[PDB]
Write a protein of this length. Structure first.
Length: 626
């Protein structure tokens, strides 16, 4: 019923000693929300300033108590009092005062459902605006990778609530320095030491975050202490990733008995630069060059010729001859039928037109300086309906590089395993038709690269390694825009290999409709769960009318098994015969489906599924049925 619950602390009065605190609650239409049953001041704190506990030390949140005692004022406002304010007798009205307010998900009396809400707000010791703050991060950065509105590990859903409990005082009282939040937060994302009684090694978090301070520390005018990540070096925080130093004993580092001299040597400029240098260098290399790719079908031979024009950062032509010694790999993959690829993985056309500065004999550079390659696989243009009039070609490439500079590929046999030796570059996509009519294109309106980029960064070099140059996905291959006119960077190019027939094996669920689900429900469920919005803005259910069969398993003799396309898409996470699929195989067939059968039968029945008579999935709730 209520989509968003807004909370504001509108008044703080110390006129009776302990503060009286009024909160005003509104819904998404700014109407007052009356009848909240689980509103609480989870923490009352005050801010001990930087340096007060010792030279170089951080500011800290000193505890003053909590309260679940409040009156519903019947107008949207709620007024708290404290039965046991400041039981340690440390209150100091010269300090900034903070209240952390939480409302649990639940229902009002009438049964209106109400979602969780959390906030903090800061004041001076009289309830006016505060004079100074410790505002370093905000809760939004966490939502790039952890589902917003759900608990992150435990207790709460917004980082300021974590910070309000995991204080220096909290850590000291337990004798556990590592549970102060500014230690813990880096700890649980960095693999240099384990955490918890389970000794969990954060291998996955390490792979995603990659010690990239900028995914949490973002410059902002609303966060006046945002530069603290480079301006306040302390042994307590820096040791969370640098786990091998013993500052007291002078092991791995000169002895330091306190934090008084850290900043004298570790100046902010150096700490900021050194921890971001590698991502900055790589991103600078990626934005040096681009490519513009065209393709045309020869109407008589039915082969596509692909032309690649390197350009510089301004879009100005660059003869590929001038940089060929630095091109580590360039690959061209061509399939047919963008909405339902027809060549499969084995029948696709693919070539490394360049490898470590060498042109393949099947590719040339023409006098205009463009690279030119003509397909050799039978493209079967026009042999499977109107969609098969269109070939689509994915171009990925990489350039040799060292310490932020492009370099000559000096070793012809370099196998691409050592990714410190080269940079994946901006990939491209080109369309061509046999008929010469306008090409079909795949829908890109339900999932795009901005969502992938929230967790993997916009500079994600997909598949970089021994097998591929690394595909960086940008507006180079955009061919439509959203309702606000912003170019959509789609994943339709990935279908060149992620075909309805799978990838190199029939057992991988390699079709793009299945592959991203399989990978992330298996390896990212702690971050995503059933949160379809982590990738989707909506579902394009109409696209199923353009789909054929989808490969879902391999037979015992290694050949391919196929399902009808809706059933194939749902069963990646809802395996037939498992505890995750109430429908038996027999019931699914009764709904028109083919389940792990032959390509012919699955193709024949592909528009026979009745699933959407009952199922009406939306990204907000994909489980919805009539
Ligand atoms: C948008 C549709 C995408 C795409 C194209 C990819 N991702 Fe993710 N991903 C996430 C996590 C936690 C993992 C596991 C990492 C690990 O186990 O170490 C992955 C894995 C991948 C891969 C595998 C290759 C790799 O270098 O890891 C690939 C190719 C991939 N993903 C592509 C996390 C997320 C998300 C977290 C909420 C988001 C959203 C996405 N990924 C989105 C995408
Ligand atoms: C993407 C760049 C992320 C950002 C931004 C944040 N987190 Fe994260 N976190 C991320 C991953 C890939 C993992 C590993 C998940 C797994 O299943 O192993 C984590 C882990 C955590 C944890 C540990 C709990 C756990 O699930 O293992 C915590 C407590 C955590 N993350 C908190 C957290 C906070 C508070 C963030 C905002 C300051 C935040 N994360 C951002 C990925 C990313
Ligand atoms: C008090 C009201 C808390 C809130 C808010 C948050 N956490 Fe917490 N956390 C709390 C306690 C009492 C403990 C156990 C401390 C101990 O003595 O072991 C924890 C522990 C964690 C841990 C484990 C850390 C480790 O073992 O090294 C993590 C990763 C953690 N908490 C994460 C976390 C997050 C992300 C929070 C905000 C969403 C959060 N906690 C809030 C108490 C409280
Ligand atoms: C999200 C997963 C983060 C990443 C990645 C990095 N930091 Fe961080 N940092 C994060 C949080 C939630 C906090 C606590 C903020 C608070 O209000 O308490 C911090 C804190 C720090 C600090 C302490 C600043 C202080 O005033 O004492 C430092 C010095 C710091 N972080 C440094 C730092 C560096 C150098 C990082 C990249 C290598 C980095 N952080 C990443 C969240 C996250
Ligand atoms: C994990 C999120 C980290 C935190 C917190 C801090 N550092 Fe760091 N540090 C980290 C990495 C991944 C690296 C290597 C980066 C690279 O590209 O080489 C570093 C490196 C340093 C260095 C240089 C290495 C050396 O041998 O001295 C220094 C001087 C350094 N880091 C200092 C430093 C300080 C002062 C921190 C607290 C403010 C700090 N690091 C936190 C990862 C992480
Ligand atoms: C000058 C006398 C320094 C003082 C004071 C502090 N640090 Fe230091 N530190 C200094 C140097 C010259 C280096 C190595 C530089 C390099 O690039 O190799 C370091 C290293 C560190 C590191 C990184 C350790 C590693 O990656 O192996 C960290 C995390 C670090 N220093 C932290 C730190 C702290 C917390 C300090 C105050 C207690 C501190 N340093 C003071 C020079 C000097
Ligand atoms: C042929 C040149 C490919 C292109 C183009 C793309 N992918 Fe790929 N991918 C390919 C193979 C041979 C495999 C392994 C077999 C399998 O099907 O799993 C993969 C695997 C993936 C995975 C799973 C995790 C992994 O093994 O890395 C994902 C998530 C994936 N592929 C995604 C993906 C995307 C988003 C692409 C377009 C940018 C893309 N692939 C293109 C082969 C090829
Ligand atoms: C990123 C890791 C994803 C998550 C999380 C979810 N989906 Fe997805 N989905 C993803 C991709 C790359 C694709 C392929 C798009 C293409 O061009 O083929 C899909 C596809 C679907 C479809 C097909 C219709 C469409 O919009 O393309 C459906 C019905 C679908 N996905 C459902 C779905 C549901 C219900 C999810 C939450 C449990 C979900 N997806 C999550 C990537 C990702
Ligand atoms: C992985 C990306 C999934 C895809 C693809 C589909 N679903 Fe799903 N579904 C998924 C999860 C993680 C869950 C949660 C299970 C739990 O108990 O937490 C669900 C749940 C459902 C449900 C409700 C559960 C039930 O027993 O009925 C329904 C009705 C459902 N899912 C339907 C459904 C359909 C029709 C799909 C294809 C369009 C589909 N799901 C895909 C994860 C994923
Ligand atoms: C009405 C007669 C239905 C038809 C036609 C289809 N499904 Fe269904 N499905 C239906 C119900 C009442 C439920 C349970 C809803 C709940 O919340 O419990 C489901 C469930 C699913 C699920 C989730 C299963 C699970 O998590 O255990 C999936 C993935 C699913 N259904 C897929 C699906 C397919 C592929 C269909 C066409 C072949 C199909 N459903 C048709 C009701 C009905
Ligand atoms: Ca206010
Ligand atoms: Ca909030
Ligand atoms: Ca760690
Ligand atoms: Ca282009
Ligand atoms: Ca039909």
């Amino acid at each position: 019923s209520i989509q968003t619950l807004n909370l504001d602390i509108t008044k703080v009065s110390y006129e009776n000693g302990a503060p009286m605190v009024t909160v005003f609650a509104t819904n998404e239409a700014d109407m007052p929300v009356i009848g909240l049953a689980n509103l609480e001041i989870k923490k009352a704190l005050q801010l001990i300033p930087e340096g007060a506990t010792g030279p170089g030390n951080s500011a800290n949140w000193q505890g003053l108590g909590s309260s679940k005692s409040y009156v519903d004022n019947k107008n949207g406002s709620y007024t708290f009092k404290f039965d046991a304010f400041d039981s340690n007798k440390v209150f100091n009205a010269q300090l900034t005062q903070r209240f952390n307010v939480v409302s649990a998900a639940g229902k009002l009396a009438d049964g209106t459902t109400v979602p969780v809400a959390e906030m903090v707000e800061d004041f001076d010791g009289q309830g006016n605006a505060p004079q100074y703050t410790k505002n370093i991060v905000s809760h939004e950065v966490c939502a790039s990778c952890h589902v917003e509105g759900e608990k992150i590990y435990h207790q709460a859903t917004e980082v300021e609530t974590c910070i309000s409990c995991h204080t220096q005082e909290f850590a000291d009282g337990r004798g556990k320095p590592h549970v102060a939040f500014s230690h813990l937060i880096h700890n649980v994302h960095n693999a240099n030491k384990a955490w918890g009684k389970d000794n969990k090694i954060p291998t996955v978090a390490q792979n995603i975050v990659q010690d990239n301070c900028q995914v949490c520390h973002v410059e902002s005018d609303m966060l006046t202490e945002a530069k603290n990540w480079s301006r306040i070096p302390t042994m307590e925080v820096c040791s969370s990733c640098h786990v091998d130093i013993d500052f007291a004993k002078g092991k791995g580092h000169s002895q330091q008995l306190d934090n008084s001299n850290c900043i004298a040597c570790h100046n902010s400029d150096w700490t900021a630069e050194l921890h971001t240098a590698k991502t900055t260098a790589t991103k600078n290399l990626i934005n040096q060059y681009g490519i513009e790719t065209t393709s045309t079908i020869n109407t008589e031979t039915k082969a596509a010729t692909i032309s690649v024009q390197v350009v510089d950062a301004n879009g100005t032509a660059v003869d590929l001859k001038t940089i060929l010694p630095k091109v580590q790999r360039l690959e061209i993959i061509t399939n047919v039928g963008p909405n339902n690829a027809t060549l499969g993985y084995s029948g696709k056309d693919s070539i490394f037109a360049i490898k470590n500065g060498a042109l393949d004999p099947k590719a040339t550079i023409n006098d205009a300086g463009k690279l030119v390659y003509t397909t050799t696989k039978d493209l079967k243009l026009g042999q499977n309906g109107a969609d098969s009039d269109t070939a689509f070609s994915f171009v990925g490439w990489s350039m040799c590089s060292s310490e932020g500079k492009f370099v000559d590929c000096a070793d012809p046999a370099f196998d691409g395993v050592d990714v410190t030796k080269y940079t994946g570059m901006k990939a491209d996509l080109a369309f061509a038709t046999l008929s010469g009519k306008a090409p079909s294109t795949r829908h890109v309106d339900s999932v795009n690269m901005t969502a992938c980029a929230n967790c993997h960064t916009a500079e994600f070099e997909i598949h970089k390694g021994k097998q591929h140059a690394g595909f960086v996905m940008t507006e180079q291959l955009s061919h439509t825009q959203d309702a606000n006119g912003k170019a959509i960077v789609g994943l339709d190019a990935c279908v060149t290999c992620h075909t309805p027939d799978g990838t190199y094996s029939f057992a991988n669920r390699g079709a793009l409709e299945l592959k991203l689900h399989k990978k992330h429900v298996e390896d990212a469920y702690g971050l995503i769960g059933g949160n379809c919005a982590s990738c989707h803005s909506d579902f394009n259910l109409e696209s199923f009318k353009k789909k054929g069969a989808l490969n879902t398993a391999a037979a015992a003799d290694k050949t391919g098994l196929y399902s009808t396309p809706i059933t194939a898409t749902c069963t990646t996470c809802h395996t037939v015969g498992s505890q995750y699929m109430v429908h038996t195989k027999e019931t699914l067939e009764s709904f028109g489906a083919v389940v792990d059968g032959t390509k012919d039968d699955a193709t024949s029945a592909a528009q026979s599924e009745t699933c959407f008579y009952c199922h009406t999935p939306t990204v907000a709730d994909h489980t919805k049925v009539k």
